[PDB]
């Protein structure tokens, strides 16, 4: 035994931590650890955003109905007034509608030459539940989500994410709401090929029917480049022609698999979303 | 009119209907007194559950070792399947290849044998032709091989199978070994099996045959995977069990005027009882030559 | 380099490996079943074979009787050599003791026989049997020796 | 998944019958080899300067004295030819050498005690399987059928033979029996130590 | 060897001469080893839903003994206060609260009660009560060691019970979580009359012979036979 | 160390900066003491500057709880979930000034290695380097020593 | 030799976890068909035997008594009898043995 | 010391839900300071690590090593223990999950040296643990076949990156 205390204290919180880590305690809400206050969270909710957000609103598009449901039973076995709670079901919907036609907008001037079905594809990625919670986590909305489970499910989370941009749209109205729409999901397409939003089977029918719109010739494929053909590593290019002029050419281990992708290069080349296509301007409108 | 492969989900739904109905008999579970008799653990009773333990699960209680070498019972004794529920409180043993007097495990496993080259058949065929499964003869193993009764398509009347078709035939029976499939057992009414053949006439003419025997009008059933078949007789666990397994000839046998029934034969032997590569092949030879049903 | 070494070394020596065989051998014709280490009860065996030869010369025969003098070491035994374990093998040319290995010993985990003289009141010991003629692949070779009779027959 | 022999299941009816059976069937399959002559021979072609016909695999029976009409005194070493078939031919082209190849095989042996795939190459040449087959290079004129037995008058008095064997096993033995014996910081490759001789 | 004979069997063959103990100090019973006149309950008893006379005379005595202890003792009361003693007991399992159960059980009792269940989870339930409860027997014990006098009393229970056991891995091995099920069982409750903080506490229950067979078991079981030594032979 | 500790790349929070700039900082919990000699700087920086700071930076909701304390503290949390604790023990106002600036401006991301100084989503304007990007094509695309009309 | 340096862990687990030094598995185990219990199948059943020498020492002892002495091995055949048997014919002019049991199934009488 | 094996069997899991599937029941079962030393215990240890009850009993028995038998009654007393106190239905269907020996207390003695030297001769104990888990032994881990190694190699080339530029 050695005098002291101050080293019996450090590894203290030296154990504790081993305590910790070996037993990762069950993740909580927010709102219930220390150093909360819902009201100053979400005014700063609107101001982190620059966003005049109506308080009343925004509280509202916070509020699910699984929470409501929730809080009635916790309330009525623990018997004790009556509970006006408004969910943010009619939020979400103005929320969800105006996106949809919004980020359709933005996509149909961006790219005039994208068909119906690539545009509401791009749509449904862009409002899909993995980009919308993303986006909703990363921007402090799941802190302030009133729901029933912890952590908030996709489902819900997606639903406040939008109830909050019905919010927006009636406090700073359309063209506030398009900028919030640009800033926070049109971004999410930086650095994604557009088939990876889109997901598409079969792009050489595809790239067929697109031709034949136009009055193009059916495409040719024909052999531009060959490497080790006889090996397990071959490279193939194989270019598609059309009146014997060049459209596309893709690269791939197999001549099948290159076809497949000189399809893919003909199509993203024909809707204008090529990968050296002019960037989105976020240039505030002047 | 159905097709095979649609034939063949007909025919799973009612075997799998019936063998719920069967289970929903008994509601609660029932507690029955097994006891063993054999020379082995004298003495040991098993209090297994009425309609849905079988003489598998009282092997399990024992050992591993009753597991592995265990290919029939005798409940009652009777010839049981390992996997067929026991119905009431009775007397078990366990029978073996290897034991003293094993009679009635070589019967089940030749008309186990049998019944797997059935399924092989049945699918190997292409779909044009129709292949008809009349029956398994009950052969004795001193015989030199299990033989299928089968009336292939009028089509077919000149082709005959060549060497190479019939290796053609091992490799898919092999491929089932290999499946490691369990034979299940359905013991049900002369009525209800009867609508699971209905589109075979060799079947419902058999069905009918043995449901007259029985005063009580049951016909056993038998399924390895998605294949039905009747049997006369219980059969060997699981199709594992065969290691070294051939199907020696086919055999046309007269008259061939009334319909050409082609004998389809093999030779089986057991992990238990395998044999040196060159007495396999002796035992194959004496397998291609015909056998007569006596 | 031991080609064409027949004979074990054991004991402490020539004259001691003799002894311990005697031993060995005295110990089976008075008990008629001994267990000892595997290899000496090997070693032992062709011994036991031959005392059982000499015994059928019979107790008139000088050599023999020398023979039993030296490897009986309890003289009471010469007596049942001649009088009754020669007389029981009458009949055989061979084979008068069978030997089967044993468990392992539960001391120095020595490999380990047992060793009789065939014929002893004895309970006898579990010998190992061969399969039953009845079996699956008995009953396949039967049918098979079956039919070559009637091709040879023909 | 357990070993298993030949006769581990059989039953003392069916082992003398088993045995009988597979010795019967190896007499039958020597004799069946012995007129290679009427059984569509490959060519038979003169010997010519540079040929290099087979040889064979015998069994070394012992040794003898011999005497010569000089009076001189000559130790001899029978080799007897025991089941000597021809096996196998290889072409030049597929042998990976100058000469093409003539597998000879040597005494017979049981089957029970064989690998499969050494059964299955044997059944197909119908004859008992052998315990030795050796290879010898032989040219395109000396080809010999496979099947085709080899006889010890294959050799004749007054010729010479190289023989090759393997030599008596000494186990693990010293310098001065392996060697007869009694620094530049490391042992060279090669060096003379004990070992299995 | 677990006996006390074995072991002073084993100390008289070792020379360890174990000296008793005497001290003013000795073991305070709360409660006693078993029923004071097991009250065999009539066969046909569920069936149904002077000899009497001489049994209800001594519960007449014995209840006399039970108010000098306690003057303001109704025998009318207890079956509900029975009651309720049986479900709180009960209730207690559920959730292991052994310090509660002590007071609501004997300490005869509380080892049934807990023992088995020790590494398993119980779930039980009354869901409803189908006749009313009432005492068939009162008995009282005679002046016994430390002027200790009980008083057991015997109630007749015949309620509808809900019983699910699961083992050690959260599987179930007993009964069904929800459906209700018809129970007859006779309760013993005793209580030490001397101890001036004695109360009424379940003691034992009774069992006849005829009582039905209990629910099944889920799992099948195997009761081996003899394991013989190789000398001995197997008789049936 | 750099093999003995993690790595990441260059990255913002939600394209930070694209369309608009959002301060990654949303809390801040200081912890003081009324007493104690350690909280003499975190005491004036709550007296002085805490309320200019909380003007200056509306979206950081900023708690300050003085209880007693031997070290008093600042956790600050971001919106990608990332919990940084500070000790501002025994440090002067402008001390705890800088810190809390830097606690503002930073992004939540862990601080460790960063591989390159710079990331895009776009490396290549003209389509990536490969093998035949400044190779000639052939007529026919014949190979070396392969024979036209075989 | 001294060792030059101390062995690692990481050494000495290769060398005291090669495969050569691991028990193999063995293959050769059976169920005994009298007793049910294991043995291999080249040695004699364990339980099987001691069941023999168990009841071959009851019938030492009881030669020991008959002989009562040491160098008193009999001149003729001995026959070993159990309770509720009989000489036979065959079995006549021999050492007879008595043992106070019944005979075991496995032991038959010849 | 330390005496946490024993505790393992006290664990008592949440009755679990009927769309759940049956968790497998778990058993652990040691012996304390066996007269042993745990180098000589690892190997039969190791020997029966993911064999079935059977299977282990089996090869124990006919193993010459001390160590043998001493954990075959470890092993025959957790088979038993696993039926009759944790539920287990059939005594057969149990394989040893984790089979391991540990270091013991072990005893120093005045040893000799044949030079007059004195010399501390240790007396070794060890530990054996086992666990046994309810249901038929894990398939063992097949070869990695010529098909697998190919999917990583050309899964390797593909993951390649420019190194060390933009
Ligand atoms: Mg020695
Ligand atoms: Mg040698
Ligand atoms: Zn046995």
């Given at each position: ?286 | ?294 | 380099?031991?080609?064409g ?150 | ?22 010795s019967?069937?190896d007499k039958?399959q020597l004799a069946?080899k012995l007129?290679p ?16 016909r087979v040889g064979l695999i015998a069994l070394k029976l012992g040794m003898m004295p011999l ?7 000559h130790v001899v070493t029978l080799l007897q030819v025991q089941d000597c078939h021809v096996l ?14 003539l597998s000879v095989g040597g005494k017979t042996v049981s ?16 004859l008992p399987p052998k315990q030795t087959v050796k290879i010898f ?7 010999i059928?496979?099947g085709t037995p080899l006889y010890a008058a294959h050799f004749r008095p007054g010729q010479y033979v190289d023989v090759t064997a393997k030599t008596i ?29 | ?236 | ?150 | ?110 | ?166």
């Amino acid at each position: 035994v050695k005098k002291g205390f101050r080293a019996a204290f450090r590894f203290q919180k030296e154990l504790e931590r081993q305590r910790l880590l070996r037993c990762p305690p069950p993740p909580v809400r927010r709102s219930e650890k220390p150093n909360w206050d819902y009201h100053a969270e979400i005014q700063a909710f609107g101001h982190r955003l620059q966003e005049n957000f109506s308080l009343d609103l925004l509280k509202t598009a916070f509020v699910n109905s699984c929470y409501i449901k929730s809080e009635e039973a916790k309330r009525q076995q623990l018997g004790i007034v009556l509970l006006n709670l408004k969910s943010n079901q009619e939020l979400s919907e103005q929320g969800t509608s105006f996106s949809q036609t919004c980020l359709t907008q933005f996509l149909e001037d961006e790219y005039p030459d994208m068909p119906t079905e690539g545009i509401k594809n791009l749509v449904d990625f862009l409002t899909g539940e993995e980009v919308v919670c993303h986006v909703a986590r990363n921007l402090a909305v799941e802190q302030l989500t009133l729901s029933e489970e912890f952590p908030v499910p996709p489902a819900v989370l997606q639903q406040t994410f939008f109830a909050v941009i019905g919010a927006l749209l009636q406090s700073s109205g359309p063209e506030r709401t398009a900028l919030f729409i640009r800033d926070f999901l049109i971004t999410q397409m930086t650095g994604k090929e557009l088939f990876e939003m889109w997901k598409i089977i079969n792009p050489m029918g595809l790239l067929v029917e697109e031709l034949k719109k136009r009055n193009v010739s059916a495409p040719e494929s024909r052999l531009t480049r060959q490497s080790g053909g006889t090996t397990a590593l071959p490279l193939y290019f194989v270019g598609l022609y059309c009146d014997k002029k060049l459209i596309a050419e893709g690269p791939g281990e197999t001549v099948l698999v290159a076809e497949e992708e000189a399809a893919r290069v003909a199509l993203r080349k024909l809707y204008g979303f090529t990968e050296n296509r002019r960037p989105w301007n976020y240039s505030k409108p002047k | 009119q159905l097709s095979p492969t649609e034939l063949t989900e007909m025919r799973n739904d009612l075997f799998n209907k019936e063998k719920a109905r069967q289970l929903s008999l008994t509601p609660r579970t029932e507690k029955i007194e097994v006891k063993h008799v054999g020379k082995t653990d004298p003495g040991t009773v098993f209090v297994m559950n009425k309609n849905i333990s079988t003489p598998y699960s009282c092997a399990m209680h024992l050992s591993e070792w009753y597991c592995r070498k265990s290919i029939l019972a005798l409940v009652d004794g009777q010839p049981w399947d390992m996997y067929k529920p026991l119905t009431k409180s009775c007397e078990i043993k366990f029978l073996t290849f290897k034991d003293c007097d094993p009679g009635e495990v070589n019967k089940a496993y030749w008309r186990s044998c049998a019944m797997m080259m059935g399924c092989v058949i049945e699918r190997a065929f292409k779909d044009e032709y129709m292949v008809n499964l009349v029956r398994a003869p009950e052969v004795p193993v001193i015989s030199g091989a299990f033989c299928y009764d089968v009336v292939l398509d009028s089509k077919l009347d000149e082709w005959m199978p060549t060497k190479e078709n019939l290796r053609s035939f091992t490799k898919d029976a092999h491929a089932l070994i290999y499946k490691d499939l369990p034979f299940e057992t359905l013991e049900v009414e002369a009525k209800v099996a009867l609508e699971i053949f209905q589109h075979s006439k060799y079947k419902v003419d058999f069905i009918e045959e043995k449901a007259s025997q029985n005063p009580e009008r049951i016909v056993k059933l038998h399924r390895i995977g998605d294949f039905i078949d009747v049997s006369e007789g219980p059969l060997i666990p699981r199709t594992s069990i065969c290691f070294q397994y051939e199907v020696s000839a086919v055999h046309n046998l007269q008259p061939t005027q009334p319909s050409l029934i082609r004998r389809f034969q093999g030779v089986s032997l057991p992990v238990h009882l395998r044999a040196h590569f060159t007495i396999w092949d002796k035992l194959l030879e004496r397998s291609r030559k015909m056998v007569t049903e006596d | 380099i031991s080609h064409g070494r027949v004979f074990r070394r054991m004991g402490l020596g020539p004259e001691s490996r003799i002894h311990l065989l005697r031993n060995l051998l005295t110990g089976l014709v008075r008990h008629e079943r001994i267990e000892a280490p595997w290899a000496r009860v090997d070693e032992m065996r062709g011994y036991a074979e031959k005392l059982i030869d000499y015994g059928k010369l019979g107790d008139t025969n000088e050599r023999a009787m020398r023979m039993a003098d030296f490897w009986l070491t309890e003289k009471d035994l010469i007596p049942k050599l001649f009088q009754v374990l020669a007389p029981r093998y009458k009949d055989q040319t061979g084979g008068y003791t069978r030997m089967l290995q044993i468990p392992n010993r539960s001391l120095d985990r020595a490999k380990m026989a047992v060793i009789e003289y065939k014929g002893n009141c004895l309970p006898p010991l579990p010998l190992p049997r061969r399969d039953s003629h009845l079996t699956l692949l008995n009953q396949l070779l039967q049918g098979l020796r079956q039919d070559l009779r009637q091709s040879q027959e023909a | 998944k357990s070993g298993t022999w030949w006769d581990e299941h059989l039953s003392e009816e069916n082992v003398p019958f088993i045995k009988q059976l597979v010795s019967d069937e190896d007499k039958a399959q020597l004799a069946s080899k012995l007129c290679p002559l009427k059984d569509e021979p490959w060519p038979i072609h003169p010997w010519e300067p540079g040929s290099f016909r087979v040889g064979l695999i015998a069994l070394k029976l012992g040794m003898m004295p011999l005497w010569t009409k000089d009076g001189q005194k000559h130790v001899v070493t029978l080799l007897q030819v025991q089941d000597c078939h021809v096996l196998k031919y290889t072409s030049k082209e597929n042998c990976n050498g100058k000469m093409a190849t003539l597998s000879v095989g040597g005494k017979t042996v049981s089957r029970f005690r064989k690998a499969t795939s050494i059964l299955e190459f044997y059944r197909e040449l119908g004859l008992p399987p052998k315990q030795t087959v050796k290879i010898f290079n032989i040219t395109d004129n000396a080809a010999i059928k496979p099947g085709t037995p080899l006889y010890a008058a294959h050799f004749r008095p007054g010729q010479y033979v190289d023989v090759t064997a393997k030599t008596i096993g000494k186990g693990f033995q010293g310098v001065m029996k392996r060697w007869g014996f009694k620094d530049i910081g490391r042992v060279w490759p090669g060096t003379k130590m004990p070992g299995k001789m | 060897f677990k006996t006390e004979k074995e072991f002073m069997q084993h100390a008289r063959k070792a020379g360890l001469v174990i000296p008793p103990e005497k001290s003013d100090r000795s073991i305070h019973l709360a409660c006693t080893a078993g029923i004071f006149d097991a009250y065999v309950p009539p066969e046909g008893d569920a069936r149904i839903s002077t000899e009497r006379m001489k049994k209800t005379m001594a519960s007449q005595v014995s209840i006399r003994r039970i108010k000098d202890y306690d003057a303001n003792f109704k025998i009318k009361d207890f079956p509900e206060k029975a009651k309720d003693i049986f479900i709180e007991a009960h209730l207690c399992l559920n959730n292991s609260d052994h310090d509660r159960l002590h007071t609501l059980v004997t300490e005869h009792c509380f080892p049934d009660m807990t023992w088995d269940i020790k590494y398993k989870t119980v779930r039980w339930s009354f869901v409803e009560s189908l006749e009313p409860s009432h005492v068939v027997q009162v008995r009282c014990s005679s002046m016994m060691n430390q002027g200790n006098v009980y008083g057991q009393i015997t109630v007749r229970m015949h309620t509808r019970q809900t019983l699910a056991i699961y083992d050690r891995f959260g599987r179930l091995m007993y009964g069904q979580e929800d459906v209700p099920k018809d129970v007859l069982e006779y309760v013993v409750f005793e209580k030490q009359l001397t101890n001036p903080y004695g109360s009424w506490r379940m003691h034992t229950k009774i069992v006849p012979p005829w009582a039905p067979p209990k629910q099944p078991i889920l799992k099948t079981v195997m009761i081996p036979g003899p394991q013989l030594k190789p000398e001995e032979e197997y008789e049936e | 160390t750099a093999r003995g500790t993690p790595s990441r790349f260059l990255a913002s929070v939600l394209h930070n900066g694209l369309g608009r700039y959002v301060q990654q900082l949303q809390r801040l919990s200081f912890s003081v003491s009324r007493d104690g000699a350690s909280s003499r700087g975190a005491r004036e920086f709550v007296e002085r500057e805490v309320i200019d700071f909380a003007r200056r930076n509306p979206g950081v909701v900023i708690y300050v709880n003085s209880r007693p304390c031997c070290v008093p503290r600042v956790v600050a949390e971001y919106l990608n979930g990332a919990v940084r604790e500070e000790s501002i023990h025994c440090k002067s106002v402008e001390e705890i000034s800088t810190l809390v600036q830097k606690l503002a401006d930073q992004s939540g991301l862990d601080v460790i290695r960063i591989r390159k100084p710079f990331h895009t989503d776009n490396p290549s304007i003209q389509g990536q380097w490969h093998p035949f990007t400044n190779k000639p094509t052939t007529f026919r695309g014949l190979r070396p020593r392969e024979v036209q009309d075989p | 030799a001294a060792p030059k340096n101390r062995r690692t862990i990481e050494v000495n687990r290769c060398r005291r976890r090669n495969p050569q030094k691991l028990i193999k598995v063995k293959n050769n185990i059976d169920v005994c068909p009298e007793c049910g219990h294991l043995k291999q199948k080249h040695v004699l059943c364990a339980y099987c035997y001691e069941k023999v020498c168990k009841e071959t020492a009851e019938i030492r002892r009881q030669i020991g008594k008959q002989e009562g002495g040491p160098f008193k091995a009999p001149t003729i055949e001995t026959v070993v009898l159990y309770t509720g048997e009989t000489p036979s014919e065959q079995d006549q002019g021999k050492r007879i043995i008595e043992r106070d049991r019944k005979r075991p199934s496995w032991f038959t009488q010849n | 010391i330390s005496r946490k094996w024993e505790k393992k069997n006290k664990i008592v899991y949440p009755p679990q839900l009927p769309g759940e599937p049956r968790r497998p029941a778990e058993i652990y079962h040691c012996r304390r300071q066996i007269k042993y030393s745990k180098d000589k215990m690892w190997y039969l240890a190791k020997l029966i690590r993911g064999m079935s009850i059977d299977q282990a009993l089996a090869q124990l028995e006919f193993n010459d090593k001390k160590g043998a038998k001493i954990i075959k009654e470890v092993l025959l007393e957790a088979q038993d223990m696993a039926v009759r106190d944790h539920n287990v239905e059939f005594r057969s269907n149990l394989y040893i999950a984790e089979s391991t020996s540990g270091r013991g207390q072990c005893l120093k003695r005045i040893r000799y040296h044949g030079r007059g030297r004195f010399g501390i001769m240790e007396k070794v104990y060890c530990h054996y643990f086992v666990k046994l888990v309810e249901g038929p032994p894990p398939p063992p881990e097949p070869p990695k076949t010529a098909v697998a190694h190919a999917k990583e190699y050309i899964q390797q080339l593909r993951s390649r990156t420019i190194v060390h530029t933009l």
